[PDB]
A and B are shown apart, each in its own frame.
Chain A
Amino acid sequence: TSLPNYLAGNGDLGSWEPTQIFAGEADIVTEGGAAGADIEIYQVIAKNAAGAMVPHDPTAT
């Protein structure tokens, strides 16, 4: 990874767009728990039959 690009091009350094989460003023409750699948950030989470933290999905038999 070493080639000093000699060309002429426009480009962006990035685009910041803030992620406000809280929409009210009630109290926050937290806990750590063991995962069962691969979880992203701020993804809605259920609990499977073993007690893990599977991400939420309705219509499951």
Chain B
Amino acid sequence: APFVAPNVQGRVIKESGYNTKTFKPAYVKPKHVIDPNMIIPRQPGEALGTG
């Protein structure tokens, strides 16, 4: 705080302000198609000969 001889008026002190930030999200769309070509052949845990 400023030093002032006790006759004179005084000193005035400045101040500060604000800031802002904004954001927007991004959009994600993965997918799969399923044929009969993917369903039919053998999933690995299945016995030989007859599925």
A contact set with B: CB distance below 8 Å:
2-4
- B residues within 8 A CB of A4? 36-37, 40-41
A-B contact count (CB 8 A): 7
Q: For B41, list chain A residues within 8 Å (CB).
A: 2, 4
Residues in chain B near residue A3, CB distance under 8 A: 37
Residues of chain B in range 7-51 having any CB-CB distance to chain A below 8 Å: 36-37, 40-41
- Cβ distance B50 to chain A, nearest Cβ, rounded Å: 14
Residue of B nearest to A5 (CB): B40
CA of A4 to CA of B37, assembled, Å = 6
Q: Which residues of A contact B37 (CB under 8 A)?
A: 2-4
